[PDB]
Coordinates of C-alpha atoms in Angstrom, one line a residue:
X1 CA 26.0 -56.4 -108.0
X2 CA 28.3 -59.3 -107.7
X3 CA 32.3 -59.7 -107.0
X4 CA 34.8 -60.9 -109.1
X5 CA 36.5 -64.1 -108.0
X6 CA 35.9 -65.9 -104.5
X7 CA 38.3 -68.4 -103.4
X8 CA 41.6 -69.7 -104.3
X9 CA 42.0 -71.8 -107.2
X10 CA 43.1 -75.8 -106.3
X11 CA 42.7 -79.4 -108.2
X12 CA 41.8 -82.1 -106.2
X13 CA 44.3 -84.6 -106.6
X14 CA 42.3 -87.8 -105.1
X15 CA 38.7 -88.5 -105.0
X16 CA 36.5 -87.2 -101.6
X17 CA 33.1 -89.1 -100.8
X18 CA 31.6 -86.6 -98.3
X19 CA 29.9 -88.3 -96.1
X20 CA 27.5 -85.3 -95.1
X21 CA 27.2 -81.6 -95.9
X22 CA 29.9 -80.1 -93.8
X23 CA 32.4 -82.2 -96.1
X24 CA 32.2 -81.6 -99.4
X25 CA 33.2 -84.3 -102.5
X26 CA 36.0 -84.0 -104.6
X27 CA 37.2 -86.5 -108.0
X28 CA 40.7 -86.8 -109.6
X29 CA 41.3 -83.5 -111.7
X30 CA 38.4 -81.3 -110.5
X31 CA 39.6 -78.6 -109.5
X32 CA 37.5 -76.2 -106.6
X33 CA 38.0 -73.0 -105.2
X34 CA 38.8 -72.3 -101.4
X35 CA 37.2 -69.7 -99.7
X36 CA 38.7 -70.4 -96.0
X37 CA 40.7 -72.7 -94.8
X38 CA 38.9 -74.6 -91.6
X39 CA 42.4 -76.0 -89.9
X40 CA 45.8 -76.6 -90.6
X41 CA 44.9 -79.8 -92.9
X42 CA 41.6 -78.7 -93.6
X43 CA 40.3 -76.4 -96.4
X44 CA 36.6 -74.7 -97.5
X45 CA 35.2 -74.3 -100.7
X46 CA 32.5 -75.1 -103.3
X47 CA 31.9 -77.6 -106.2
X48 CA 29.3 -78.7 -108.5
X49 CA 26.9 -76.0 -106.5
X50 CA 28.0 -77.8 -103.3
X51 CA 30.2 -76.2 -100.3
X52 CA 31.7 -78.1 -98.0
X53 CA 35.3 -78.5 -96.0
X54 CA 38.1 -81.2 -96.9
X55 CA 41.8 -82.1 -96.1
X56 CA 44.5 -80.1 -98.4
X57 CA 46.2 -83.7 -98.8
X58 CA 43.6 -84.4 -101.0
X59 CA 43.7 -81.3 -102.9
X60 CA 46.5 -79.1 -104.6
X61 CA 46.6 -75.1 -104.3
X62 CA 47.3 -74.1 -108.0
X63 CA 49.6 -71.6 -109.6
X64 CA 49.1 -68.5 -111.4
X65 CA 45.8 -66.3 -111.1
X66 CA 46.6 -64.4 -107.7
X67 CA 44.7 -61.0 -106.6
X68 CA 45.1 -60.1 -103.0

């Protein structure tokens, strides 16, 4: 039926207005979780039933749950 987790767990450090849907918004403490990661200062995930891509300076990869 459906999977266990998708993504890897991060907290977005600053706010993100995204501007259109490729780019996805972000605020100060909510955290998102990163399916891909679209360049080496990019990232992809989903938030608030949104998915989008935005910069890992703005976000921080979290510690702790890992299952490879």
């Amino acid at each position: 039926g459906s999977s266990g987790s998708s993504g890897r767990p991060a907290r977005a450090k600053f706010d993100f207005k995204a501007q259109t849907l490729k780019e996805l918004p972000l605020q100060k403490g909510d955290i998102v979780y990163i399916y891909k990661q679209i360049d080496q200062n990019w990232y992809e995930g989903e938030h608030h039933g949104r998915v989008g891509i935005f910069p890992r300076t703005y976000i921080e990869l979290l510690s702790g749950p890992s299952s490879g």
